[PDB]
Amino acid sequence: MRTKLYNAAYFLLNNNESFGHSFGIRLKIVGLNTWIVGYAVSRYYFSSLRVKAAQDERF
Amino acid sequence: MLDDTKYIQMAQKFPRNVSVQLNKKLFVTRTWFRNYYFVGVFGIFAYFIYNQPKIFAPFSGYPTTVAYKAQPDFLNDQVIFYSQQRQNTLKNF
Amino acid sequence: SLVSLFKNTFLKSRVIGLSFQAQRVMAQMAKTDFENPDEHFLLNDAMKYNELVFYGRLAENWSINPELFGKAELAKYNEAKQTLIDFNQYHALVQNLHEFYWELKTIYLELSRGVATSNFHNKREVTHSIIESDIKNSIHKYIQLIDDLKDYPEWQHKVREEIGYYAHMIYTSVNHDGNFPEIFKEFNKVDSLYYF
Amino acid sequence: MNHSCQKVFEGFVSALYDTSYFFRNFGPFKATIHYATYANYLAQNWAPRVSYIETSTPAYTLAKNKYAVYIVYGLIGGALIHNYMLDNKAAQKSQQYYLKHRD
Amino acid sequence: SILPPLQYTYSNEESLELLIHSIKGNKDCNSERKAFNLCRSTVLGKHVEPEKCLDKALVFVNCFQKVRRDESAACQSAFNSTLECGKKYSESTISLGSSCQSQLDAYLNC
Amino acid sequence: ARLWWTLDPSKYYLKQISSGGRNEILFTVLGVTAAYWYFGNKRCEHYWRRQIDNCQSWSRAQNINGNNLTVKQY
Amino acid sequence: MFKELIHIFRTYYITFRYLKKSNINFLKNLSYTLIAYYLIINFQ
Amino acid sequence: LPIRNIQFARYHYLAAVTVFTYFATRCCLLDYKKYYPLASVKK
Amino acid sequence: MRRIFWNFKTAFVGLPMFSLAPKNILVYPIVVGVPLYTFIVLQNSVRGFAYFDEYDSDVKEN
Numbered sequence A: 001m002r003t004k005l006y007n008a009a010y011f012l013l014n015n016n017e018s019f020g021h022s023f024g025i026r027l028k029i030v031g032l033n034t035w036i037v038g039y040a041v042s043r044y045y046f047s048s049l050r051v052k053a054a055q056d057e058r059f
Numbered sequence B: 001m002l003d004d005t006k007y008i009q010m011a012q013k014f015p016r017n018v019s020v021q022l023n024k025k026l027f028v029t030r031t032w033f034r035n036y037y038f039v040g041v042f043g044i045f046a047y048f049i050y051n052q053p054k055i056f057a058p059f060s061g062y063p064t065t066v067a068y069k070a071q072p073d074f075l076n077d078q079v080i081f082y083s084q085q086r087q088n089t090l091k092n093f
Numbered sequence C: 001s002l003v004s005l006f007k008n009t010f011l012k013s014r015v016i017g018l019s020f021q022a023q024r025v026m027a028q029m030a031k032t033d034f035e036n037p038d039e040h041f042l043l044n045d046a047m048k049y050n051e052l053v054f055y056g057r058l059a060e061n062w063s064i065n066p067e068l069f070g071k072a073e074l075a076k077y078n079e080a081k082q083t084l085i086d087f088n089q090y091h092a093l094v095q096n097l098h099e100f101y102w103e104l105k106t107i108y109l110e111l112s113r114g115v116a117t118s119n120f121h122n123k124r125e126v127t128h129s130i131i132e133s134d135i136k137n138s139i140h141k142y143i144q145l146i147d148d149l150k151d152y153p154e155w156q157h158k159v160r161e162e163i164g165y166y167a168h169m170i171y172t173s174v175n176h177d178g179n180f181p182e183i184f185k186e187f188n189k190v191d192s193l194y195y196f
Numbered sequence D: 001m002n003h004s005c006q007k008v009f010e011g012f013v014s015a016l017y018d019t020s021y022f023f024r025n026f027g028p029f030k031a032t033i034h035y036a037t038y039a040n041y042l043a044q045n046w047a048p049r050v051s052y053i054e055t056s057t058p059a060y061t062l063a064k065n066k067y068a069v070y071i072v073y074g075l076i077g078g079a080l081i082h083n084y085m086l087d088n089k090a091a092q093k094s095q096q097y098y099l100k101h102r103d
Numbered sequence E: 001s002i003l004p005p006l007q008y009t010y011s012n013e014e015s016l017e018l019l020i021h022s023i024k025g026n027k028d029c030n031s032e033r034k035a036f037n038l039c040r041s042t043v044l045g046k047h048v049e050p051e052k053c054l055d056k057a058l059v060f061v062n063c064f065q066k067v068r069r070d071e072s073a074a075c076q077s078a079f080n081s082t083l084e085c086g087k088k089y090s091e092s093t094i095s096l097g098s099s100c101q102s103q104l105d106a107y108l109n110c
Numbered sequence F: 001a002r003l004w005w006t007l008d009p010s011k012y013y014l015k016q017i018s019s020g021g022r023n024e025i026l027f028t029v030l031g032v033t034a035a036y037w038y039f040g041n042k043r044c045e046h047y048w049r050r051q052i053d054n055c056q057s058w059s060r061a062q063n064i065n066g067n068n069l070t071v072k073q074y
Numbered sequence G: 001m002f003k004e005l006i007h008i009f010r011t012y013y014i015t016f017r018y019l020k021k022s023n024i025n026f027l028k029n030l031s032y033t034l035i036a037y038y039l040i041i042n043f044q
Numbered sequence H: 001l002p003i004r005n006i007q008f009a010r011y012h013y014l015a016a017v018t019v020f021t022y023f024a025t026r027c028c029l030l031d032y033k034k035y036y037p038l039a040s041v042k043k
Numbered sequence I: 001m002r003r004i005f006w007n008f009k010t011a012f013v014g015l016p017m018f019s020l021a022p023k024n025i026l027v028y029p030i031v032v033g034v035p036l037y038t039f040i041v042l043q044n045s046v047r048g049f050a051y052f053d054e055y056d057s058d059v060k061e062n
Ligand SMILES: CCCCCCCCCCCCCCCCCC(=O)OC[C@H](COP(=O)([O-])OCC(O)COP(=O)([O-])OC[C@@H](COC(=O)CCCCCCCCCCCCCCCCC)OC(=O)CCCCCCCCCCCCCCCCC)OC(=O)CCCCCCCCCCCCCCCCC
Pocket: A034, A035, A036, A038, A039, A042, A043, A046, A047, H030, H031, H032, H033, H034, I019, I022, I023, I026, I029, I030, I033, I034, I037
């Protein structure tokens, strides 16, 4: 059975002011939360790093 | 009051011998998707909560440490060690 | 027997108190759909739902000491115990139907992930045999279930409206060629006409 | 998939389903799960709280339910302040003791 | 506990005396201290053969002792004023206020 | 978009127990007792300490095999 | 807040649809427990 | 309808969020090792 | 063969996304963090960004 397909609406709709206005707020909140979580993860990651070793050192 | 007549009837009168066989494969597929989204998504948050304190507060997890003193042994070319137990504490603020 | 007194008092209190609520909880469970029958209790208000689920087992299993019971009190306790057993069976039935619903929804979700626009990596033109067999057997079981609920028009109608929805969406997801006439043979009788 | 791999996969998923079902529905395991679920529900949905819906006329509400927040705050603040005072007293006592013992 | 334990118990008066003398010394005899630290930085000078630093160490200690023993009358007066101000500041369990910097500057210029 | 942020408590968790308000005082008593015990132990361990460094504080080292630790000058 | 995160993941991710409301609630309970543990432990 | 001690609940939730964010991000307890090259020296 | 129909320059998912998303994602980050980060960094440096050299940096071995 050949599965049916469709043309995604957002690929063929003229850009509108409503999309912009609403997705702007959604992206603002997404950016805020992502920035907070990424800052936490960045602090964790950098603090996880090892200490600098000597030159040509084994173990 | 809401007219829950039909729902009341459904609750009062339900079959007590009707059951449906479950395709084991599809049940397993859904459950393992659930496990995928637990271990690999919520696992990140859980491990962060569990470990980040252990990264920023390490001194409280290793209570006792050891210290050494050494002396030479010339006639045998050896080194003699004396150990000592200490309470692992901050130093050089 | 002080410990016996306390055990029996605890059992009486919990069982009788919950028996007055079983009607409401069962009605609410019927009201929602089969995707998450306990949705209202998890999200909005736990109207003694978890209490019923927990104390049904105790009513079934824990013993009784009639000498600590009155006459009317003992009759009331037996009535409440029977109500809790009825709730146990009702919950089991709803769970079975809900799991079958989730089977059908799993099939539909696989199809949807197949036809998703973001699916640039696993796009398949022709449905493979395994999912076709799964669809056929799932629809067979669904038809058998509908038949088995001929004595309960409300239950039959709810099962149709809830579970057959995803059967209809699966019907719409594919073209009418290949093995389609055979796969949806049972569905084409009555259910297909309902979902138009 | 290949029908041989199909046999293997069907057997494996059947084994997984059977194992899960047995572990969940075994007598002792079933009882353990059944009790722990209710314990978890009690803990999550009936944890101690300071804010709750008041559905009773002022004449039908106890005094405890009008001053519970204040009692809790008093207890916690008193505990913190008393621990602080005990820390200061212990600091002074230790200093004096080790001073009088030497230097 | 994570804070290190104490070795020598210093009285509050003794602690303030040593602290003020140390602040004065870091100005009067910084040269000796720097030389001693330089000689105690190397592996040979710190662990293997510390005696090569001994002389330098001695000099430093002498200087510090000379500071600890306020010889000039003006030095004694300024040090006593600063020490009294420090004691008053320390004993003040009530909300603390003005600092003792003025007395310290007066003493360091003696 | 829809506004959803708020500090108000959710009605799902706002129920009382049958006999009155939720068990707040009873749990706070336990919390205070536990805090008292924990902080008392911490304070007692922290404040009554000294570091004594002399010959008697050193003992002979040994391997995990129990033998005396000695390393050659290889 | 948690509700909103779950809602966004459900509405945007097709795979996340596999989880029941019960599994979501279990994640909610575990997350609340972990948050309480984090708050308590950081002060110890 | 009335909610006992609603304001206390709001402030408790706000405090919990603030404390959790403070400890998770360590927003206030930054690291200055990156600024050391861009700093003057004394003594 | 997957055939995609898409108005690159006018569809809501296209150049309009490039114009919209970057200026909206960074709204709260900039306006909050930058003042907040500045306050957090500067409040330490009431007197200056001075490194009180605990080690003899000016001392070089002869
Ligand atoms: C498409 C390809 C793209 C490829 C990209 C490749 C990128 C490679 C990056 C390499 C690593 C860089 C690390 C930089 C660290 C900076 C901090 C620092 O120096 O710390 C010192 C660091 C110690 O760190 P720490 O002090 O402990 O903490 C650091 C923290 O950041 C905390 O420090 P802080 O407190 O000072 O923090 C400052 C504060 C500052 O925050 C603020 O205040 C924000 C201010 C923002 C202002 C922005 C203004 C922009 C203007 C926009 C205008 C638009 C107008 C539009 C108009 C339209 C029309 C109207 O917070 C932040 O900086 C926020 C950071 C959190 C980020 C949150 C988002 C994370 C997820 C998203 C990531 C990006 C995805 C992009 C996807 C693109 C797809 C197309 O130690 C060092 O000395 C390390 C130096 C850095 C090198 C590390 C090397 C590691 C190597 C690992 C091995 C693997 C490497 C792989 C490389 C691959 C290359 C391809």
